[PDB]
Each structure stands twice: as C-alpha cells, then as structure tokens.
C-alpha cells in the first residue's frame, strides 16, 4: 500500500521535473513566469473541481463500504456534485474566458486557452473522482497504476501540445496532464471490478451532501487564499520588472517543489490518520512534537543540500539562463523549512476538521504574504518575493507555536 504510493509519487516527481525542464529550456524565464499563474489554476482545479469532495469521498466510501445501500448513496451523491459543478465550471470558463485570462496573464490573449479548460477540467473532476473511489475501496494498485499511466501519457500529451501549439500548447499540456488521468482511471475501474458501475448514477442524499459540503468549503477556502495571493504577487513582480524576472523566482519554487513532495507524504499517511484517533491533549502534543523532531531535520538537510548544489540544480533541472536565482535559494529554502514545519500544525487542524481554525490559518498566510510583498517586491524584484516568502513563514511559524501553546494550556 505505502509502496504503491511511493511508486506513484516517484513517477509523478520524475515527470514533473521532466516537463518542468522542457518548459524551461524551450521558453526560458519568460515562459516559466508567464505559466506559473496558469499552473496555479490547474492545481486549484485539482483541489476545487467536482466540489472538491474527493477527500470526503474516500473517507465515507471506506466508512460505508460494508453497507450496500449507504455505499451507493455516497458514490451517487458524489457523482451528482461532480456532474453539476463540472458543468457550471464549463459555463464559467466559456463566458469569462477573457477576464480570467486578464487576471492570470495580464491580457486577454489567452481566451481560447481558458475556454479550452472548460472541457479539460471535466477530465480533472471525473478523473479525481475515480481515483478517490479506488482509494476508498482500498485499491492502492489500481490507484497507483492509474497515476503512473496518467503521468506517462501526460508527458506524451505535453510534448505534442508544445511542439504543435508552441507556448500556448505547452500551457494546454500542463492542463492535460492531470486531466488525461481519467482515461486510465476509468479503464482501471472497469476491468478491476472493485466498484459496481451502477453506483455512479447521480443521486442526491441531503445528509451526505451536507457532510460532503464541508469538504467543499475547505477546497473553497484553500483555493481563494494562497493561490490568489501568489497570483497578484507574480503579477506585481511582472509589472514592476518583467515576466522574465517572475520566471527567475518561479524556478526556485519549481525546484523546491520536487523534494518537498516526497517529504509531504512522509508525514501525510503516517501523521494524519494518527492525529484523528487520539483525543487527549497530552497525546496530541506527544505526536505534534515528535513529528517535528523528524520533519524539521529532514527538510533542513534536504534544503541545505539543494543550496549546496544550487548551481548544479539550476543547470540540471532548468537552464543556465536561470543562473541569477542562485541567490534566491538561501531565502526561499529557509522559508520552506518554516512552511513545512508549520504544516504539522496545519494537518492538526485538518485532523480535527475545524473550519474556524482552517480559515484562520489560510488567511494568516494570505495576509502575511500580501503585506510582505507590497514592501519587498517593488524594491527587490524576485529577491523581494523570495524574501516575502521567508518573512511570511518566519512570522507564521512563530504565530503557529503561540496559537498552539495557548490552545495546549
């Protein structure tokens, strides 16, 4: 099970580095910067499409997998939420394609790309639902093979998209990578025969829909905080300097997201299920502290190694046209430690399913990101964004400990 997840995370990382490298070598810092706001929208779609209930889907599919009547209502209401929201999403993308292009790119020259997303997001919503269902039925193999195939065809789709369409093709490729996974997930769901197909018939259970709505509010809150913040910050950096300067700072985040993904799963399936079962404050503190005793030195060592080979990392994963960001590593990699450090406090809020505290944590990150950006970015450029990213999580980590200590007492 956990080795299936490792296989998925590995192929996903390798393919992500591969497509990230090809995008860098082909379109340079201007392309990496211009594409970042578009890549921010795709990940949000993976978070907030099909009502963003797929975390709750897997939880309740496994909870009611023994009761056939309640299992059918869970999958049935999940398909209904996906169908309704995927269709409304399509209408939103065809009618507001120009204003969405403006917010993401600064001009309306990407309307056709935004309108095409209306069809692409359907594969993301339906694909992630089929993956969530396979996770709920404890099918780690069917989940992993679907992700591996989806990553393999995503590289093929991205290569053909950018060769034909140019830069806007490469952007379409970045959306097609998570959307095409619905092809192997569907084929795997069929032949593995774990889930009856009639269960996918859209029905509506007001009980499960309201409970699954709480997962929708989480994705809603998540999608309109840090993504919105990072969008305005890259836009302000581009306006005061250039999109080429945004790609300098974007290359730093793109390099860190590689090793920061494997460490994420090291305290995801190992920490989140454990923090849910425990109920005593002493036992909560005994695992919050002991998780930091492993997570902090692990990211510190990994990030320090990246800074030790900052020149090699730039040359390897990107191009020597990104050499200017070697000075950004010290500030961003520090902020990475404090950000992942505060993740332990974030997964504690998710384990308690506290919407109140989840809202407070996301807006805290959003605010600190916005204040520190209006001061650093207009003066220091990409270094200002890397300094705002570090100043944010230096304060946010310290606030997270104070909030935890008050809550602990």
């Amino acid at each position: 099970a956990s080795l299936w997840t490792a296989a998925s995370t590995l192929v996903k990382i390798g393919a992500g580095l591969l497509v990230g490298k090809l995008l860098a070598v082909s379109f340079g810092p201007a392309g990496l910067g211009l594409a970042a706001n578009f890549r921010q929208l795709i990940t949000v779609l993976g978070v907030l499409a099909g009502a963003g209930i797929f975390n709750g889907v897997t939880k309740y599919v496994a909870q009611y997998h023994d009761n056939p009547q309640q299992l059918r209502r869970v999958v049935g209401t999940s398909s209904a939420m996906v169908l309704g929201f995927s269709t409304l999403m399509a209408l939103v993308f065809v009618l507001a394609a120009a204003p969405i292009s403006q917010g993401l790119f600064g001009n309306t020259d990407y309307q056709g790309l935004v309108r095409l997303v209306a069809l692409v997001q359907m594969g993301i919503a339906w694909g992630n639902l089929l993956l969530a269902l396979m996770k709920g039925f404890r099918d780690a193999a069917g989940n992993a093979l679907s992700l591996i195939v989806g990553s393999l065809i995503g590289v093929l789709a991205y290569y053909v998209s950018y060769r034909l369409g140019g830069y806007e093709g490469a952007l379409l490729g970045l959306a097609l990578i998570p959307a095409l996974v619905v092809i192997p997930a569907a084929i795997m769901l069929i032949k593995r025969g774990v889930i009856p197909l009639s269960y996918l018939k859209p029905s509506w259970d007001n009980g499960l829909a309201g409970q699954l709505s709480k997962f929708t509010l989480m994705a809603l809150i998540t999608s309109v905080t840090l993504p919105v913040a990072y969008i305005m910050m890259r836009k302000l950096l581009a306006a005061q300097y250039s999109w080429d300067e945004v790609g300098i700072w974007q290359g730093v985040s793109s390099i860190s997201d590689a090793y920061l993904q494997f460490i994420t799963a090291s305290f995801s399936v190992y920490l989140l299920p454990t923090l849910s079962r425990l109920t005593e404050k002493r036992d909560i503190t005994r695992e919050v502290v002991k998780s930091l005793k492993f997570v902090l030195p692990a990211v510190a060592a990994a990030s320090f190694t990246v800074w030790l080979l900052r020149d090699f990392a730039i040359w390897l994963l990107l191009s020597n046209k990104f050499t200017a960001m070697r000075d950004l590593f010290a500030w961003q990699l520090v902020g990475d430690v404090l950000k992942v450090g505060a993740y332990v406090f974030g997964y504690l809020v998710i384990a308690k399913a506290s919407l109140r505290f989840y809202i407070l944590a996301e807006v805290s990150q959003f605010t600190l990101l916005m204040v520190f950006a209006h001061w650093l970015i207009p003066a220091h450029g990409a270094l200002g964004a890397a300094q705002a990213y570090m100043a944010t999580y230096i304060v946010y980590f310290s606030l997270c400990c104070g909030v935890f200590l008050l809550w602990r007492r």
Epitope: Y241, E245, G381
Partner: nanobody
C-alpha cells in the same frame, strides 16, 4: 568595483556606436548597471539601466527603441549599443553600478561611477 569606459567619439547623424564599460572587481554579476548622460552645465540624466539579474532593462522615452543596454558577465563588460544617433544625444556618457540595484532613474541610487566618455554627433 571600478568602472572604466570607452567607445565614444565623433560620429555623423544616423550612424551607430557601441559604448563599453569595463568593471574591474569581483561579484560583478550581483551588481546592477546604468548609463547616464550629462550636458555641459546641466545635471546628469538617465539613459538606460539593467536589473542586477539581467532579466529586466529600462530605457528613457528619448532612448527606447534606439539604444540597447546589455551585459557580458564573462568579461565583466556592460555595453550601450546606440543605433540611430542624432545631435540630441551629444553629451558625456557615464556608466554607473549598484549592488542588487539597477532599477532607478536617479544618479544617487548608484554608488560607483566611471570616468565618462564624450559622444558628439554632427549634422
């Protein structure tokens, strides 16, 4: 760092000319550069500058489209390729430097300066 300029001289209207600023010192990649012009008896004015990362360049209205500023970090040289020269460009040209800078129009935002080179253009 120390800046030593060259490349100026007397040219006719409409011809090109390239000015070179040789920076002598270490960590020249972390330094942003700017080109300034000065009329006899008037203050120094902004012509062009490059961001210290080398991704962004800034030009004045009377300059944009005509002159091009670039850098060669292998030789620690900064260039000002002037193309459609006109008598209005007749001045003394200074190259300036600033650590983690190069995005200002004011001369006070530049620490190190060059000796200056005279560019005169007739007709």
């Amino acid at each position: 760092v120390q800046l030593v300029e060259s490349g100026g001289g007397l040219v006719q209207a409409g011809d090109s000319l390239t000015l070179s600023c040789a920076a002598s010192g270490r960590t020249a990649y972390r330094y942003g550069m700017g080109w300034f012009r000065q009329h006899p008896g008037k203050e120094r004015e902004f012509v062009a500058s490059i961001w210290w990362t080398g991704t962004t360049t800034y030009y004045a209205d009377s300059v944009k489209g005509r002159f091009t500023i670039s850098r060669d970090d292998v030789k620690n040289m900064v260039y000002l390729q002037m193309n459609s020269l006109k008598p209005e460009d007749t001045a003394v040209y200074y190259c300036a430097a600033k650590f983690y800078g190069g995005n200002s129009k004011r001369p006070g935002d530049y620490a190190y300066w060059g000796q200056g080179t005279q560019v005169t253009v007739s007709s």
